[PDB]
Design a protein around this ligand. Sequence first.
Ligand code: HEM
Ligand code: HEM
Ligand code: HEM
Lengths: 108, 378, 285, 140, 57, 444, 48, 100
Amino acid sequence: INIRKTHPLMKIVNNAFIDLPAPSNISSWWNFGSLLGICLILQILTGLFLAMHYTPDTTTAFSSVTHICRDVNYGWIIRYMHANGASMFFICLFMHVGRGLYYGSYTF
Amino acid sequence: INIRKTHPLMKIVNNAFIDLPAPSNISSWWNFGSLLGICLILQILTGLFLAMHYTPDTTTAFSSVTHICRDVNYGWIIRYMHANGASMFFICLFMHVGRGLYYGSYTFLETWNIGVILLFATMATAFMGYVLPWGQMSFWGATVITNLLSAIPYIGTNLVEWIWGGFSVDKATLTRFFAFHFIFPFIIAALAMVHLLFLHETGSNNPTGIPSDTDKIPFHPYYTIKDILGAILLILILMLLVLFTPDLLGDPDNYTPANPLNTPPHIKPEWYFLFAYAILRSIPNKLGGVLALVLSILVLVIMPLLHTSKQRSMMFRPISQCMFWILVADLLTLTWIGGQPVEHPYIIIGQLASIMYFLIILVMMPVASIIENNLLKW
Amino acid sequence: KAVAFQNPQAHVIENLHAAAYRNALANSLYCPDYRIGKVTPDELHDYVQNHFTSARMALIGLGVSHPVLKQVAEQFLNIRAKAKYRGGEIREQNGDSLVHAALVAESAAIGSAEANAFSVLQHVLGAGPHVKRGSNATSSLYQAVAKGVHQPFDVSAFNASYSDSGLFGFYTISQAASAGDVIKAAYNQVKTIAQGNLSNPDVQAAKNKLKAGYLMSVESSEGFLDEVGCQALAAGSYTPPSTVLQQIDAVADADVINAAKKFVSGRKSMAASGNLGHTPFIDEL
Amino acid sequence: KAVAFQNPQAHVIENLHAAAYRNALANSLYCPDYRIGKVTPDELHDYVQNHFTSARMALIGLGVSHPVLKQVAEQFLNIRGAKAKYRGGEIREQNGDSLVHAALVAESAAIGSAEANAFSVLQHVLGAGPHVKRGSNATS
Amino acid sequence: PTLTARLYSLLFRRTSTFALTIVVGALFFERAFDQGADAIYEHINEGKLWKHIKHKY
Amino acid sequence: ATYAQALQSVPETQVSQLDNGLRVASEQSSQPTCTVGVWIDAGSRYETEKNNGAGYFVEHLAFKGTKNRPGNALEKEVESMGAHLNAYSTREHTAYYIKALSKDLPKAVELLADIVQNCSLEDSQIEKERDVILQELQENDTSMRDVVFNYLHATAFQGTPLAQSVEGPSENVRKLSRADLTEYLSRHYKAPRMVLAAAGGLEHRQLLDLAQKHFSGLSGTYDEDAVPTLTPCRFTGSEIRHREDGLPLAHVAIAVEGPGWANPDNVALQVANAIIGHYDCTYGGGMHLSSPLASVAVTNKLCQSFQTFNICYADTGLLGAHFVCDHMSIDDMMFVLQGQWMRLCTSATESEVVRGKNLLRNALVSHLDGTTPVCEDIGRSLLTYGRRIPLAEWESRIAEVDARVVREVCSKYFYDQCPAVAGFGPIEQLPDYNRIRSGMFWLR
Amino acid sequence: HTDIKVPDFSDYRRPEVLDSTKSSKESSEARKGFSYLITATTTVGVAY
Amino acid sequence: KWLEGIRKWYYNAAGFNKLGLMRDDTIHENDDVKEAIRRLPENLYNDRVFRIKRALDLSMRQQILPKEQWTKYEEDKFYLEPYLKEVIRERKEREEWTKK
Ligand code: HEM
Ligand code: HEM
Ligand code: HEM
């Protein structure tokens, strides 16, 4: 019949992402799960590129970060994207905890 | 009723480690799943300590590794655990593959394909880690395999100046390989979970190849103590290797610093990649060599599409059994020829060993299989 | 079996046939409740062996030619129990608040002036109604019980005819606490028709209704196929429908009154199902 | 009901008392097939209120004293159908269990009288349950 | 309203046609949008960029 | 053999017209049984807001006497000639037929004229019919298939009078009087729109002359205002779901855009619904049927039954699929149903089209078997098409339909249209409507 | 169940549909083209 | 012919007469073989699962049967082959009906 209900990975993908019974009156505060997840994959990806251009040595660590920001193509956009994505990550995290405390989700 | 059969974590642990129905027949060759798992988490832990004491730059990498093996407490045993654990990891990986190919467990399709993707991932990870110590052999291994990626026309040279991090093996190459070696085993762990998921979907095998639906025994506490026994045997082999002869497998030519001018005479991999290097230099053609290597591991992809027999195992087929042992001796011959210089008898029998490898797999398995299908009146 | 017996009528007719005969006609078209899953195929093989022989086979072809069918029957078909009457009842407390009651005496076998008299008698007493959503101003039993009881109900005659015996009676669909009045009123009406109080134009209307029923059972080729095959299998000669109508209107109401007397004076049998707190047993009838 | 009618004897005796009376003795010990689930507490209140009266009750004590029972039933109770006709008939069951059970039963007597005592004498003349285990029943 | 009927009938009935449509639109829109934003950023300063003063130098 | 020559010897429909615009239609064959009926274009579509429940009510009052023969003498004489009298009425047409013997024709036609043009109205009769029709409303509530088709028309033709039910609602029936029925009969059962159709053992000059004696003088003098003329009704496309979890099975119907009557797209869609068509849970040979939906539904025990079918109304209709399935297999059944529609519309092979043509030939010949369904076809054909189209023309239109034109027409009508979905029962596992519309077209 | 008619959404309908006397076929093409036009332009921007 | 001598030596040295198995206890199971196993009489099916359970037991202990209980080539009661041929013929007939 359906690959989406018989394949062993796609059973998990179907039961978590498509055929999930969700309530019908979500307001915008129920976005912050996806916002924290997409911030997480963005921070991991930009961080992995930063970790490809970084040298952890206390003589040349700050010079390596300056080398990232000045000399590498768009490395300044990746560095500022990582830092400001961390700040937006904690913004979305405190919105998430505020939702979870205010709407009484702490009975779980 | 019970804690275990209702809780959402312990249902996963119950269908993995406690009440998984496993067959009552599997020999010691079905221990290398758990041995690869324990080697993988041991690599992750000991490598994490090495990465806490390591500075990835082409000026100070070799100096920092020497600082680990002299000045930091027990850095020498943790570094030797990491290197010889890579060696024992590929021993148990090739024994795992040899089991899965000999006992007809390649009739599974999706588990086998995710297996081959795991083989690609572990080989690329171990090569990047072998580049990391920044010795002479690591420098020239990185150079030659990156030019092997440059062998392909219309894609190659731009791709290779792209992953060079410049125009040669510069600082950026060492940092790139540090980052990818330092991330790829987590992807290997996730695909190992996917591998194990498709296995627990289908169900395991046994040395007869007969489906064992009548005689499943639970995993705990029979195979758990069997895998503890296998783990103790593996740790004693690994630890005797790191405490008595740590140099018996490693390269002597690593320990010089990276001079980009010398090019030593006896250039070679670490011993697990000899047959990949032996198929390469036994074909006098660039694209032919790299394509024949990729076609070797794609032949391992091909192997489920040639199961034209009607038993499952090779326990009951003696002709294919003898041909499989010819295949094993031929792969060990390729490893030995790769671990040698290149002269006239070595050239001839390297070419003959690669030819006989492809002839055994792509021709001799179905011919032995069709003599089996003819001979027992089927 | 579940899909077939979701109706009540199948239950009541099968309990009727299971109650009237002590013998081979008591068996049902459908499998019983406990024989499901517990029948070997060897019984099917032995049944096909000692019943599917060429002494018992009528082969009918509509639209096709004769000699092709003859040559096929030559090239392929070369391959070669006095039902006693019991009396009594089957009563089944079911609980749908619609009492179904079938009251049946033994009548006659097929192929007789007596059998045609019973067919005329079921057309006197009323069949499946003609004018749809009508009032049935001609069927005698409905007139008698609508004179009696002011409820929704239905009364229908019932003439099953087989090659050895036959079952004549009627069939009542009534409410819960109204069943006995309907059955007794219908029984009184059948008794006063068996008395002899049946005029001439009612019997002429019954002859016209039987002529209409027989000639309208052969509109479609399904029913015509079944008619030709069953009659050729009965004796071995298809008698045309015009002389069948001749044998229908040959009879007179003396045979009709004799048939009704033979109904009333015989030993009754019944099958009832539903909410049966008021259905009279035998002696109250 | 399932555990009760895994014995054939119960189903034979219930068809027996259904086939020999048109009336109040033809009520089963057990609830039938279709009434399971469709009996409500309204009928429970009705049946309790008009079949549990203070004249239809015998309080019997074994090991207790009479004045204690007199106190109990004097303090704490304080609350306040149709005869069965013979019918005659038969009920058969096609069950295929390779043991034909058959009860042949006629109307004999009401309780209390020497007529019923004479029928008890008659059943012990004819034959009862086996007095000797694994015996031959040569008195029956 | 008729101008969208043939648009639906030619570029949205299929799926592969829809994909080819958005790919060709992506390339054409990339070119036109880069030229437009370059014109906007030149217009918004007109006296400060390296380009015009370097061809004056 | 000689199937073309077998279709040339199919008898011909004699069509003629009386001076009131009456359409008389005799089919003379060689049987001793005849069927005579009146077909009228007067249904539950022409009604007003408060005329709802008029065709049903007049059908239930047409058999209860008249001003010529009182009370029940009509029933008495029809059973005195042994005829079966029947009537029906849908949203589009209304018929009264009589199944009788051949030599009992002219008195039957006289009674038929007294059915049509003299249906008087009695007040005890109108109380009786009000009571009986309320009983029939409450008992047709408990059926399921009629509830599903009424819900389907109600959610498919919103506002437009095609969504008026044939029974009408409860409150437009429990207050009707003689005035509404009087204007109903004065406006709808007119003479230039009714068809006398008679098939069986009767000639044409005989029937024509009897109609000239009796039907001539009926009507044709239509009154001054409100002449009935249709409006092209709007197929909205929506869903209605009656969630009622105290039921064993679930009923789902889904239908798309209307083919109509005159266009040969009707023929192409009947080929497509001969390909998919029907299944019931009580067939033999479950695992091996030709319909792939039947193959999957027996292989995985999805549904009890379905019929994928057509309904055509005047210049509109529904291309439909009704399936009856248990409350744990609704999503999968819906998925395979849309999979079969799109397998027709994307990659239709030749063999299935040939199978559909043969099954539709046998369906048409089996439906035109016996005089009463063939006279039924003649009545509905002289109303809808304006002529009974003969079987040689049906064979030409079938044989001139091949696989390419089938996938063209089916991609015109199935592919990416807005459905009407009616659901009744335990249908919480039915997919939401946007997943249904997303399943109408598959991107691959 | 006969009294189950819709409460109509004549406030919510697009102006090509709103007449209860016109057909609903010829006002379908432009409507689907408009919605799929919006989806196509969004897909172009995201791919860019 | 000597090829029968090859077949007898091969059935001796093949290793599945050692564990008390007959010819059709070692068949690999795709969908067709699963169908042919489901199409069996009851006594042969119970004898089959018993021989299979003894084979898994004897390979668990890695002990091979005494001389007096090896299955012999002269009494080779191969039984699963007719049902398996019928499955293959009906499957190929269905495949050809789909192809044309
Ligand atoms: C595993 C993935 C990650 C890697 C490889 C990574 C790598 C790095 C590296 C190399 C730096 C130093 C570069 C720099 O600061 O200019 C850095 C900085 C930083 N990272 Fe990450 N990071 C990862 C994930 C995260 C996550 C999940 C967060 C939290 C949201 C985070 C928050 C930060 C912050 C706040 C800084 C300091 C930025 C600054 O002030 O310049 N990182 N990361
Ligand atoms: C990344 C390294 C790998 C790990 C950690 C790994 C892990 C495992 C584990 C834990 C099992 C279950 C235990 C067992 O059956 O032995 C397993 C089974 C299996 N693996 Fe892998 N595997 C790896 C690589 C491979 C490769 C390269 C292949 C070959 C393509 C492969 C093929 C199989 C097969 C066929 C089985 C089933 C064996 C059986 O049921 O008897 N695996 N693997
Ligand atoms: C994510 C987990 C891992 C980490 C954190 C890690 C970390 C490191 C570090 C820091 C080094 C440099 C130290 C040295 O060269 O001796 C290294 C080298 C190496 N790693 Fe890994 N590693 C990991 C996984 C693996 C795996 C899975 C393998 C393959 C089995 C592997 C094989 C090697 C090899 C062969 C070397 C070179 C050793 C030498 O020549 O001394 N590593 N790894």
